[PDB]
Ligand binder design. Structure first.
Ligand SMILES: CO[C@H](C(=O)O)c1c(C)nc2ccc(Br)cc2c1-c1ccc(Cl)cc1
Ligand SMILES: [As]
Ligand SMILES: [As]
Length: 145
């Protein structure tokens, strides 16, 4: 539905740890990472990874103060990203999926990536049938032509 370069990034906490979660809005495609806590440095770093892989043009968050450090503003500068001073939830969705897999993995780390994998792969409710992972790549290839 939305612009191909729009992404959302937020932190959740689970087991005393921080999971950083990026959602490509138009597809539902998630990428995630477990960090020991929220620091500008971790946020910048994660943006740098995301941007070297997708065309990121704008990043929205539900917590703006997340993006106030020089550190974060530099990553966004260097990579050509912008936010927006204003404005789901999958975050319900991802945790849920985490909850089903937790026993299968020793470290939250692993269980999260398992949950990310299940989410990106799941077949669209019915018709169409594309998974979040298939749609991201469709949107981005389609928007290249
Ligand atoms: C992400 O960690 C950085 C690093 O390893 O050098 C870092 C770090 C850790 N601190 C910074 C403080 C001010 C400014 Br401007 C940039 C940074 C930077 C920084 C260096 C390069 C880029 Cl593209 C973005 C940020
Ligand atoms: As965050
Ligand atoms: As930014």
């Amino acid at each position: 539905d939305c612009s191909p370069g729009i992404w959302q990034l937020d932190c959740t906490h689970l087991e005393g740890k921080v999971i950083l979660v990026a959602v490509h809005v138009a597809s539902g495609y998630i990428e995630a990472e477990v960090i020991p806590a929220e620091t500008g440095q971790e946020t910048a770093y994660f943006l740098l990874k995301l941007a070297g892989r997708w065309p990121v043009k704008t990043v929205h968050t539900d917590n703006g103060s997340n993006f106030t450090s020089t550190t974060v503003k530099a990553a966004c500068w260097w990579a050509g990203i912008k936010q927006e001073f204003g404005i789901e939830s999958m975050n319900k969705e991802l945790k849920k999926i985490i909850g089903q897999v937790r026993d299968q993995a020793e470290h939250l780390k692993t269980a999260v990536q398992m949950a990310v994998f299940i989410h990106n792969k799941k077949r669209k409710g019915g018709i169409g049938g594309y998974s979040a992972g298939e749609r991201i790549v469709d949107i981005i290839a389609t928007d290249i032509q």
